[PDB]
Design a binder for this molecule. Sequence first.
Ligand SMILES: CC(C)C[C@H](N)C(=O)O
Ligand SMILES: [Hg+2]
Ligand SMILES: [Zn+2]
Ligand SMILES: [Zn+2]
Length: 876
Amino acid sequence: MEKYNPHAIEAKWQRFWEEKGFMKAKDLPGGRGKQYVLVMFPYPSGDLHMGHLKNYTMGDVLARFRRMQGYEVLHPMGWDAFGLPAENAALKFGVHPKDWTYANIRQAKESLRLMGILYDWDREVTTCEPEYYRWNQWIFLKMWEKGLAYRAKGLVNWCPKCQTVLANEQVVEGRCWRHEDTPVEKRELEQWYLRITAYAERLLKDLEGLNWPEKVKAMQRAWIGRSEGAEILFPVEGKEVRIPVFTTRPDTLFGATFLVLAPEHPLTLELAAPEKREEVLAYVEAAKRKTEIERQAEGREKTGVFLGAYALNPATGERIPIWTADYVLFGYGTGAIMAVPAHDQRDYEFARKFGLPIKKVIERPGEPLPEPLERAYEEPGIMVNSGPFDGTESEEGKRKVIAWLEEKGLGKGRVTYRLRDWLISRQRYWGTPIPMVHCEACGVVPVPEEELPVLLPDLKDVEDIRPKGKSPLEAHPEFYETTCPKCGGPAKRDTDTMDTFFDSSWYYLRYTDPHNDRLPFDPEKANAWMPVDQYIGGVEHAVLHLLYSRFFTKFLHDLGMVKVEEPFQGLFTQGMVLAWTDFGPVEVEGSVVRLPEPTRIRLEIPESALSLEDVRKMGAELRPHEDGTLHLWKPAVMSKSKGNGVMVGPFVKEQGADIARITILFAAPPENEMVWTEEGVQGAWRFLNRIYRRVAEDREALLETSGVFQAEALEGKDRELYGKLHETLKKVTEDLEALRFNTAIAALMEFLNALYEYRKDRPVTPVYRTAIRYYLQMLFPFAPHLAEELWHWFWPDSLFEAGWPELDEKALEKDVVEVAVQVNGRVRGTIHIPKDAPLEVARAEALKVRNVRAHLEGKEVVKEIYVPGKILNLVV
RNA sequence: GCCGGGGUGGCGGAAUGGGUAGACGCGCAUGACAUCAUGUGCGCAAGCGUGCGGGUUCAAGUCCCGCCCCCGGCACCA
Ligand SMILES: CC(C)C[C@H](N)C(=O)O
Ligand SMILES: [Hg+2]
Ligand SMILES: [Zn+2]
Ligand SMILES: [Zn+2]
């Protein structure tokens, strides 16, 4: 008897599926229904390994399944070429991006193909190509006319490594999103923005009905951070100008004893007294230079300066000094606040430190407030010392005081958002050119829609297209020395480029019509496929892609190009793949494990001396090495950096594809993080072989048997096996739909054993043939190769045209289930009686269990409970 | 501190309209010419066992009250 040989059949079938084009995405989905499985396209930068294939596999499983059912499936794939990701890589190897990319893509598609993953490559999209980024511009225009795009000064975040500005969404832990070790600074610059805030309300409101992981939504809710409150205006003493401040506690206005402007606030210097200037101006240059990692280093220590100017409390009418502290942020609300030390610790503390007054205006219900106050009081209470509002409740106060303000034109009720506008301009070469020009008489003028695209200057000198603080395009007149399409005089093209995320915010839409030269996509098409039914990806893109993408769709909706309003209906996340890692040598002596500094450092711990326990307890092991010393191993993220990846190409050659799959899918729950291991790969081998044998050993026997039979006319092991099948089909089918591939397979392995047990007391019967047919169909999504192979030994056409097995509910019905006999809550034993078996029939079959255990303890009884299902309790 | 998700064998992990806890797999242990078959929660045993302590019930991983710990994300948003 032959044996399971991967290299023999895999690459064969792969070519087969590609030729016959089963995953070709239909232009316009018919009436059979349609699925749109999509995995976030990759940043071409490196070579793929098991750590990466997790996702694309999933997408494939899910994609093959649906296609098998009948749905018209669209499983697309393309490359997120432009932006920092690629450039940052091509720059670390002194290579030209256009070459480093097309190369990385080639390597990629090869891996994917080896893994037996199919796509509709006739839709492949490469962001960095003109044929695509042209539309990135077209959109930018449509956003300009609609006033959602714009330019403006102010402090922006600067990444010394990337040598360019980043959006707030790209500042994780106060560091770069790609360089989690490089702090971020601020620089006065005028960049281009996208008025995403214009959609703050909708972005937050349309989350509700969204069926996403509660973890993600909650992050967007928090990132958008809506807050209802009031915008009060404080007149400046003598001056004509008025200062707007936001507050979610206007019912305390009469308690405001001072104002605090953000260092970067304009009026912080335009009001700073000449005798204070030499200090105010020195404080700004101190805050601007400080950073996030530095600020969080000082703690909650309040620090500010007095502006030497006063303001007029529009409530009491009196004067209150105006200060400037860093604890107030300019990028939020009004960048100014009305300090009320009496009902806000922050303010309070700031007050007790810089000798400022604390006025009480909210009394605590019942238990009076200890005078003098030694801690704020932020809870609701009764108003006092607040003019005619005295006695008025706290809650009812707010709306009244606001209604009072909106009467004298002193303020108004407003709702600010934490969400800050999107900064999309980058001073890098590899990027989409902003379709704007700069005339001196006309000003900032938008390039004509029909003059698009605006190709990127062709630059070969690698040391040329490198960021040094300014836009690499700011050195090629041959590009920007163009004319203004308004007047006709000398103009200048904007040297800045669109951030990567821009093009990665509507790609899912391009796949629906990847070859359109009239529009970013034909609405008719996009509407037929959208929304994305299932989006496999990560969480790190919570406040980025998963946000920017929605805004983009909504705006595209508002142009009447896309019927839907949320691009991703389903959002399935995945966990990180891991692998046991070599953390260096160790000197073991008895039960003591000394740690040499080279290792201890990589382990990122303080201790330089553990024990054989501390090692176990932290999930590690000491193994023998090739250098003749012991090495401390431990799992770790499977990444290039860690140098522990399991390259696809190699692996597949030395093992097989379907093996990789089963290993990845069955390892754990997809949402959880797996740890790719030797032992696992083995299991995949075993599982796959046993599937082979079982079918190879009956190939002949099966070849001469018919798979036709009468359902009910079944009895014996057959009737049973047939039930086990359908019982299994249920599980597989459900789990595939819910995206629980692990248990979906665990169920397939279980039936397999069931088949081995059925063949020790029964021959290749019609029911059995059917079992095998059904099994092969249920396998096709996880091990499409080995599945397509065995299937052909008996049937003609591809498993793709087989369709998915039909469940037979009536086959699930159980007859003679095993029941547990318990007495006073302990499980004494288990009998085997029909499901409907009457209490008397069970009781009887119980009273004489294996060891009559039921008697060894039930010699009294008082009440008995029977549950047809699987239980019978005797209350002694 | 807030929000989100979780504590089950040696390990990944099953099972919640209460009803034989530990499916499937990994590891380990015996029997055959790396591969199969059998066993495998702990304790020699009384007996005990789903983070802790009470409680409801014939019956609790599932429900009720109080509490501990772990991971992830924001962290001075007025
Ligand atoms: C959809 C894209 C934002 C995915 C991203 N390019 C990544 O590889 O993480
Ligand atoms: Hg390109
Ligand atoms: Zn950077
Ligand atoms: Zn002009």
